Amino acid sequence: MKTAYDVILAPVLSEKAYAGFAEGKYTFWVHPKATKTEIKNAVETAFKVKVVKVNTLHVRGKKKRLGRYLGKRPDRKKAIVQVAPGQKIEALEGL
Amino acid sequence: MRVKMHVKKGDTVLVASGKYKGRVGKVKEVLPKKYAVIVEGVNIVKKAVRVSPKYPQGGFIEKEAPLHASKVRPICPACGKPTRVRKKFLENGKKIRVCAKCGGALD
């Protein structure tokens, strides 16, 4: 069955992600078939918050090699939800 | 399907052949893929290791090497003699290893 935990996968762990916590903007590794409307409900129904805005984008998989073979890391998608003024997703403030 | 092993870790075996032929001991491991076995104190070999946090001071470390299974032979705990493994059908009706020299069991 599909649950908000199936939409949200892992957090974006970078200097750029972190720097969004102050403004309440939390970044995640979502599902490429996920949807801004689909994400929202997933964050809320999982982090007890009020999503006010969502910004998503696709991250294409990098091409890599074991010297002799060429492949590609999977393609990923990530969202950038804005939470109501004053709310916090603590598990990410972690940091 | 399965690799046929007449010996299992860790019953007592007789190094039938090889440089350590005649020596005896327990089977410290069983390698079906290469169809080999490691025996305690047998096939000893000196191997090198980097000056590494695990192996400070560098140096070498005596490893126990594997042997082809056809080289090892089990020792019946009864007659204490190395024997060929038959297989007995109890009334369980399980099958059990049993010495061929004497009807003893081997586990």
């Binding site: 649950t3 935990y5 957090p11 762990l13 | -």
Partner: protein, 70 residues
């Protein structure tokens, strides 16, 4: 997981109800996502816990399916 544990998880599940199975599942899939974020930061050393849930979550959805196929 351990077998005996597995067996129980089947006995216990097959005693349950689809709602109590969806609700149950819905939780362990939360229990995963918790673990996913831990490993994502390296603070997941018992990383075998993951595989269990998914295969717990799997064993659950199955028994859920056993019921509904009727």
């Amino acid at each position: 997981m351990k077998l005996s544990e597995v067996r129980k998880q089947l006995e216990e599940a097959r005693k349950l109800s689809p709602v109590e199975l969806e609700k149950l599942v819905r939780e362990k899939k939360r229990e995963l996502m918790e673990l996913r974020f831990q490993a994502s930061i390296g603070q997941l050393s018992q990383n075998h816990k993951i595989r269990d849930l998914k295969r717990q979550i799997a064993r659950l959805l199955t028994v859920l399916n056993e019921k509904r196929r009727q």
